Enzyme design. Sequence first.
Site, PDB file in Angstrom:
ATOM      1  N   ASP A  40      23.215  21.677  73.256  1.00  0.00           N
ATOM      2  CA  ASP A  40      23.142  22.275  74.578  1.00  0.00           C
ATOM      3  C   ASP A  40      23.973  23.556  74.571  1.00  0.00           C
ATOM      4  O   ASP A  40      24.542  23.960  73.554  1.00  0.00           O
ATOM      5  CB  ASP A  40      23.891  21.387  75.536  1.00  0.00           C
ATOM      6  CG  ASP A  40      25.205  21.019  74.964  1.00  0.00           C
ATOM      7  OD1 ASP A  40      25.328  21.145  73.721  1.00  0.00           O
ATOM      8  OD2 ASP A  40      26.118  20.673  75.720  1.00  0.00           O
ATOM      9  N   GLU A  65      14.732  21.816  81.613  1.00  0.00           N
ATOM     10  CA  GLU A  65      15.154  21.440  80.266  1.00  0.00           C
ATOM     11  C   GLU A  65      14.041  21.329  79.235  1.00  0.00           C
ATOM     12  O   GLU A  65      14.352  21.361  78.039  1.00  0.00           O
ATOM     13  CB  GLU A  65      15.921  20.114  80.303  1.00  0.00           C
ATOM     14  CG  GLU A  65      16.817  20.043  81.511  1.00  0.00           C
ATOM     15  CD  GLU A  65      17.753  18.878  81.505  1.00  0.00           C
ATOM     16  OE1 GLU A  65      18.769  18.900  80.779  1.00  0.00           O
ATOM     17  OE2 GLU A  65      17.477  17.946  82.273  1.00  0.00           O
TER      18      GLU A  65
END
Length: 438
Positions: free
Chosen positions: A223, A214
Amino acid sequence: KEWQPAVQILLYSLIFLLSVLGNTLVITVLIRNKRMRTVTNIFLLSLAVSNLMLCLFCMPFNLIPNLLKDFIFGSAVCKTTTYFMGTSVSVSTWNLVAISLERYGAICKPLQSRVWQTKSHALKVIAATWCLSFTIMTPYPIYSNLVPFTKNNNQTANMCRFLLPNDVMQQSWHTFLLLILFLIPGIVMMVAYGLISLELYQGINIFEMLRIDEGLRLKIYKDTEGYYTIGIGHLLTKSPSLNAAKSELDKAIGRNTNGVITKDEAEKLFNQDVDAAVRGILRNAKLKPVYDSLDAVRRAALINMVFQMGETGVAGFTNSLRMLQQKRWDEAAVNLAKSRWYNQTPNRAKRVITTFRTGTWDAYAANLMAKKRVIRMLIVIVVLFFLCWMPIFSANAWRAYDTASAERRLSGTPISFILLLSYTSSCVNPIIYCFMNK
Ligand SMILES: O=C(O)Cn1c(C(=O)Nc2nc(-c3ccccc3Cl)cs2)cc2ccccc21
């Protein structure tokens, strides 16, 4: 004999040119490419300036007089080349030590010691290394002198020798140089590279894995799903409102973050997150039977998924969790790549599925493997530096304790090649970086 003179010219010339070529090659590409000027390579640059000083102000002034068997330069040149030779060793030694402590800080206490990575601190120690090397090595020009001797038939000649007032001082100096240039530097080096090699052995964990998955984003963002997230993949709100997210964010920490957040707050949040995800696996009575059955790295792959999709989202994968619970790894890997999770984020999912299938960290160990390569390179640079320099320092010490036994077993070719071993150090490292490519 009659070969030595020829082989010495053959060898000292190869070594001189290689050292001149390689060290300036290294100095060039470093001052040119400032992306290359890391903290590590800044000490590597100061190490390369010594190697060059030693190749230029010492190698000729020690072989020519060895070939001529007569020191035909001035008394001041004799004091000088002795001075730069001691300085070179000193700087190189303590730059190697610098690198080992720098790597130790960056690998073993990375977010605990930031000070030693500041590249202004890198130029601080380097400035201190040259300055203090020149200061401690001042007995060389002070006590270096031409010693006149007569080769056969009365042909008078001189020889550059370093002679302190008596035998006790000679012994004390060479023992002091053995201590502050090899014994002490060697063990600080060794404790550092040992701890470095300890951490690098343990390898990749879930925090490493999830940090690669991430990254770090210090301002709110979305996201692949579209939900607001911050830091290292911390989910704030799924509502479409940015105002509900700025709100949920400010409650993560403390103050009104206004959208941007520090790195230490992301990490504080990111540890609570990994805390949350593992807690979920053990509270969800469908995941926990599967969790128990997995080894450490497959556990991490399950923790990775609950980090991404949540406790309830991942227990939905009932088909795949059966096959993992039943050690059927290839099988559950086929299935997991038929999912929406795989289709939404394939690069991350291909990685996690490999981890599940293989029970190894192969999918995440690229940054670790590059680090191991670097440290293994430094350990070779150090080991050949000691290998190259201990002979000449050990011979000078043996000469300060028993000058009779030392000159009687070395003074011909044995010390001619021991010397050559020393000058070979200055051309070793550039050939080493060379092989560090293809
Ligand atoms: O003196 C000679 O001409 C030959 N030689 C030598 C010799 O070459 N000693 C030298 N030490 C350095 C040096 C080393 C480390 C830091 C600074 C410096 Cl300047 C440069 S030359 C040693 C020896 C022992 C027994 C017999 C003959 C021996």
